Design a protein around this nucleic acid. Structure first.
Length: 650
RNA sequence: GCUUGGCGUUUUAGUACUCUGGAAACAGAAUCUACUAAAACUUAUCUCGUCAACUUGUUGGCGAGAU
DNA sequence: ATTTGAATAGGCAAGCCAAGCGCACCTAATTTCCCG
DNA sequence: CGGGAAATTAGGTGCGCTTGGCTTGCCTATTCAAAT
């Protein structure tokens, strides 16, 4: 559209958030998320292949580019793009960082618990950050070097103040590493100067040399200070030099990782070459979280995928602040990589926005675009082998095995004997050993595992029945499991095998829905049913026609649609995304929600249902419709081809 | 692409182990439980145009439109 | 009027990921020995 | 007698092993409503 806008992006391991806002008013236009599985005319994706990355990151940059290309074609060229690459590099690194963060959140809260016991005051817990700075400094304000009593901080919270080591106006750093607990008078005297500049002036109580020695002694050994904090405390360069300010801006505002640099270089190159006035920027992972604390907007990653989108809208509003405030013009220019604030109150006033955050938080019309997998899954089948047997009723059944019979907490056999004694093969074939086992289960019924007590009390494993007491130990028990339906037969690998040798869990490729005289019906196509040829896969025709016959699908039945993983389905007027075929036999298909994983939907509600949706396709089913989202999450109601596909060249 | 081995799943061969013929050797059944030996484990949807694979009526890529 | 089918809850199992515990190896600080 | 360098001790880091949760495929079982 004619209207001019900003594009936020929150790039992640599995996701690319986007957020679109009016360049004049800062009202929300649009927002959504593009979701994908972690890789364990318009902007091309071949440039990502040029410069070397982790696979996990490499996928996201390809996905991001296609989301930018889709926004450009819909809304036209943005005025400003601004990007946030997630802190993590892969999911393991993410989890490690979350664990490290959680460990720190434990380390902070454990210090609170000890002091509120000792002192016995309530305003302590409100004073979150002033407590931890007392730990770092070893009980002394660093500018003066005089002692802080612990209760004196609680008695006089005014007479001490959290100071920024390097003025926030120059560094843009609000991190704990740029913070120090100091006396109120010392803060007032320092002003907008570094410790070096202040302690070199006539206003200071102590010499810089004394201070420097203290910091260096504080750095090594126990009660340690971070490298970044140490560097800030010992910053000697002229704050007022542009080169020095540039360094602070680059450290705090501009993200400094090889990937993030690589990405913005890709994008800026593209716009530069084609002569398109687009201002690509980036912001530091931490910085967004400051704005969330500032604007009272608790990061809830459990509040669906929208968190990625509502991160992008935040990132996009930061861009508005780095355009409307002439005092940030230097910072703006640094962030745009273009060739070339006096008080704390002034700094704080620049970033006050109460209004448009209500728009962001109360915004509703989000969109989601899950990516669809149509590659036959290398995993064909569970590799476990099962023997089979025909039971009393003449049903072929899977043979399972009970292992770990003599374990403390194993109730599998006790459950099975009480419910289904006829499920044991030994029930039919070794009655004398069966009767011998039943006497044990009756003897030590009260425990989880009767056999554990048999081993504990007597000190002897259970042996097969024998006339001379020389039968072998029993270490596994075979029992009849599932009725045998869809299986793979591998018995010709075992010459003269008495019983049939099989594998199970025929991993679905897709399911094809048919409308047959007003009744909705479907066929499952297995990965086994798909066979690699020269440069293509082929669905097996004979297995397919046999499958229709078990489902009683007529020759004059209309095909409706094929549904792969993450394909969208509207069942009785309710839209979902497909996982797969829960049960061919029962005619069930596994779906999920679109805006949130159904697990998380239930957790935010505090509901204790199973976290899976299953939808039965039946005489009761009234309409089935296929939908498809574009890469932005705009929804479309879509038809099918006349017949199902057989060959798959991709 | 080749070789070896420990743990696990399956089977055969032989022996142990249940049942019947037999004084006993020995044979048959049954195949449960074990020991010894061998083998194996990039793409959203439809429709149309166009091009190519070969399966010759289907598919995949690309362009346009719609959804 | 009774029998068959639908929808949801609850469990089993394979594969795969991730986090906490234990053993062996690597780096820095303090104490002891030798020289100005 | 005091300061600097080397050897020994204590603490921190990295690799490998194990268990619980997550994603998916599917069967058995229970309860209610519709069809022959």
């Amino acid at each position: 559209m004619k209207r001019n806008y900003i594009l936020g992006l929150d790039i992640g391991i599995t996701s690319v958030g986007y957020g679109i806002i009016d360049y004049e008013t800062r009202d929300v236009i649009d927002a959504g998320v593009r979701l994908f599985k972690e890789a364990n005319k318009e902007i091309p994706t071949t440039l990502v292949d040029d410069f070397i990355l982790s696979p996990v990151v490499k996928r996201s940059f390809i996905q991001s580019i296609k989301v930018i290309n889709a926004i450009i074609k819909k809304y036209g060229l943005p005025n400003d793009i601004i990007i946030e690459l997630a802190r993590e590099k892969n999911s393991k690194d993410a989890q490690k960082m979350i664990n490290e963060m959680q460990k720190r959140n434990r380390q902070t809260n454990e210090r609170i618990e000890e002091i509120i016991r000792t002192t016995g005051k309530e305003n302590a817990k409100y004073l979150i950050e002033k407590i931890k700075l007392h730990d770092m400094q070893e009980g002394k304000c660093l500018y003066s070097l005089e002692a802080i009593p612990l209760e004196d901080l609680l008695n006089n919270p005014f007479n001490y103040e959290v100071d920024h080591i390097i003025p926030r106006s120059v560094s843009f750093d609000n991190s704990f590493n740029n913070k120090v607990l100091v006396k109120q008078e010392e803060n007032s005297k320092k002003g907008n100067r570094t410790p070096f500049q202040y302690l070199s002036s006539s206003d200071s109580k102590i010499s810089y040399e004394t201070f420097k020695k203290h910091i260096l002694n504080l750095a090594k050994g126990k009660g340690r200070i971070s490298k970044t904090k140490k560097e800030y405390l010992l910053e000697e360069r002229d704050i007022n030099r542009f080169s020095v300010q540039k360094d602070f801006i680059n450290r705090n505002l501009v993200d400094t990782r090889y990937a993030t640099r690589g990405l913005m270089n890709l994008l800026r190159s593209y716009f530069r070459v084609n002569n398109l006035d687009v201002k690509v920027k980036s912001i530091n992972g931490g910085f967004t979280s400051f704005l969330r604390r500032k604007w009272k907007f608790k990061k809830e990653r459990n509040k669906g995928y929208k968190h990625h989108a509502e991160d992008a809208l935040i990132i996009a509003n930061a861009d508005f602040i780095f355009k409307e405030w002439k005092k940030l013009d230097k910072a703006k220019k640094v962030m745009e990589n273009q060739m070339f604030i006096e008080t704390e109150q002034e700094y704080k006033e620049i970033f006050i926005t109460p209004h448009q955050i209500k728009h962001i938080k109360d915004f509703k019309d989000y969109k989601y675009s899950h990516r669809v997998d149509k590659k036959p899954n290398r995993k064909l089948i569970n590799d476990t082998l099962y023997s089979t047997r025909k039971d009393d009723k003449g049903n072929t059944r899977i043979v399972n095995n009970l292992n770990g019979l003599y374990d403390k907490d194993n109730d599998k056999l006790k459950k099975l004997i009480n419910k289904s004694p006829e499920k044991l093969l030994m029930y039919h074939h070794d009655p004398q050993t069966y009767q011998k086992l039943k006497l044990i289960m009756e003897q030590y019924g009260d425990e989880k595992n009767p056999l554990y007590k048999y081993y504990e009390e007597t000190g002897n494993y259970l042996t097969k029945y024998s006339k001379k007491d020389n039968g072998p130990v029993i270490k596994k028990i075979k029992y009849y499991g599932n009725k045998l339906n869809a299986h793979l037969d591998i018995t010709d690998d075992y010459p003269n095998s008495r019983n049939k040798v099989v594998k199970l869990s025929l991993k679905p490729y897709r399911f094809d829905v048919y409308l047959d005289n007003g009744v909705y019906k479907f066929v499952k196509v297995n990965n086994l049913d798909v066979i690699k040829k020269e440069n293509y896969y082929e669905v097996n025709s004979k297995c397919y026609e046999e499958a229709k016959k078990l489902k009683k699908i007529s020759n004059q039945a209309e095909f409706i649609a094929s549904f792969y993983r993450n394909d969208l389905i509207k069942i009785n007027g309710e839209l979902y995304r497909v996982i797969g075929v829960a049960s061919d036999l029962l005619n069930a298909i596994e779906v999920n929600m679109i805006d949130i994983t159904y697990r998380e939907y239930l957790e935010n509600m505090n509901d204790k249902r199973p976290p899976r949706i299953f939808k039965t396709i039946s005489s009761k089913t009234q309409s089935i419709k296929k939908y498809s989202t574009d890469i932005l999450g705009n929804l479309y109601e879509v038809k099918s081809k006349k017949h199902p596909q057989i060959i798959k060249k991709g």
